Amino acid sequence: PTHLSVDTKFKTEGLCVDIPGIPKDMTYRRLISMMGFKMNYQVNGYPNMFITREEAIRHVRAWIGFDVEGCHGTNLPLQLGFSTGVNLVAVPTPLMYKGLPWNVVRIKIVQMLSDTLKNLSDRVVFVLWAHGFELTSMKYFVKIGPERTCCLCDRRATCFSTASDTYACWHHSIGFDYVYNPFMIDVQQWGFTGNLQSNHDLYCQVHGNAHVASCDAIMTRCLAVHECFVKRVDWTIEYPIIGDELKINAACRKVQHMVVKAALLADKFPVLHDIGNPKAIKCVPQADVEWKFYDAQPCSDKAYKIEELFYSYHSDKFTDGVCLFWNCNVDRYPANSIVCRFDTRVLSNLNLPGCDGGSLYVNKHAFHTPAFDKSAFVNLKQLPFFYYSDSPCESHGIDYVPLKSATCITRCNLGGAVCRHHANEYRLYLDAYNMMISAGFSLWVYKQFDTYNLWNTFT
Ligand SMILES: O=C(COC(F)F)N1C[C@H]2CCC[C@H]2C1
Ligand SMILES: [Zn+2]
Ligand SMILES: [Zn+2]
Ligand SMILES: [Zn+2]
């Protein structure tokens, strides 16, 4: 049981309005055949156009919600809608494009999918809420066959060109006209009572139905993400490295050590309440403080209520000392906190649009994150950049341009001149910091946090 068998049944009920008289008994094998695709018994890595829910989750980065609306059936024009917000009108002679033939529409489809997916995935997964027209229209922009490699590289083939008779991946597909060997999943096959809007609206207020095909494409992919990442959570599924994942994670660990170490020196809190990851370790192992840990998994639905995390009877006194919420998303942070909160609005290859304003952050693992809300941080202030060091000024072992900064909290800068070692360390840390900030993480601290209190820690 690795792939979805072509002899598995397909419920055709949601298909009988666009396709009246459709057989109740239907398989993937009969469906694909009906759609105009000859599989020809092929053992070349393409067993089925349709995929399992587990395979769809593994290839979430590849998801594109797709919906076709019968605008007026080879006699009438079709409105193609994609979760990218695009709307194409195809004729058989929220970006709403006018009526054009299939030969020109298919070119735009390859451009759009290639530009959206090149940095994200090795494939496309057409996420559907199948009513009939989306499956009839696939023969006009899709070609299938044995699994292939790009004509210009070693990545797997995702497009095809009828002009040059060649294949290409998402990167080298300029001028290509066919979507080669795509994947798809029908969300209606998962046992839903009622239509798309009714089921989507149960979990999301952010996507509205303007009645265009792209709105349904967005609601479909949203509902698919809710089902697989919000209500169901699988943190065992690993995901490929497609960006700055290792530098972002390394930066995160450096920023946390720094920020937490400095707060303990500036305000000498006797106790630290570490609320978050049940698999966490002391980020400042040599600190004087009393480290008390409290397990809390990453919330994927709605941000935790601070009342339910702390109260109902542990130190019990969370007001004693400082609270460290490192990626533990709560509705309103106490005033004595140090917080790292991922901003779901950040635009990146790691961040995918989520459910109810939240986002799917995929970095080694998929984490659906609740919508960033600026009000969560009313009793806190933004933590400013600073680099603190108590290490000796010793170069050991790159070139040098004198460093001048007010945010380099070191003994050398106290003395009047920053040494080469602390200048390399400051610049390296500022890069890790800028990396982590740009990757969408925001840092917040208690209002009394003053870096002026760190200069006295060398006496
Ligand atoms: O092949 C077609 C369109 O008709 C043909 F004559 F062009 N289709 C695609 C399949 C979708 C399920 C029912 C099938 C109808
Ligand atoms: Zn290529
Ligand atoms: Zn939604
Ligand atoms: Zn120094």
From Swiss-Prot:
Positions of Zn(2+) 15 binding: H200, C204, H207, C222
Binding site for Mg(2+) 2: E69, H211, D216
N7-MTase domain span: 239-459
Active site as annotated: D67, E69, E134, H211, D216
Domain ExoN: 49-230
Subcellular location: Host cytoplasm; Host endoplasmic reticulum
Binding positions (Zn(2+) 14): C150, C153, C169, H172
Name recorded for this polypeptide: Guanine-N7 methyltransferase nsp14
Organismal lineage: Viruses, Riboviria, Orthornavirae, Pisuviricota, Pisoniviricetes
Gene from which this protein is expressed: rep
Included range, full protein: 5949 to 6449 of 7096
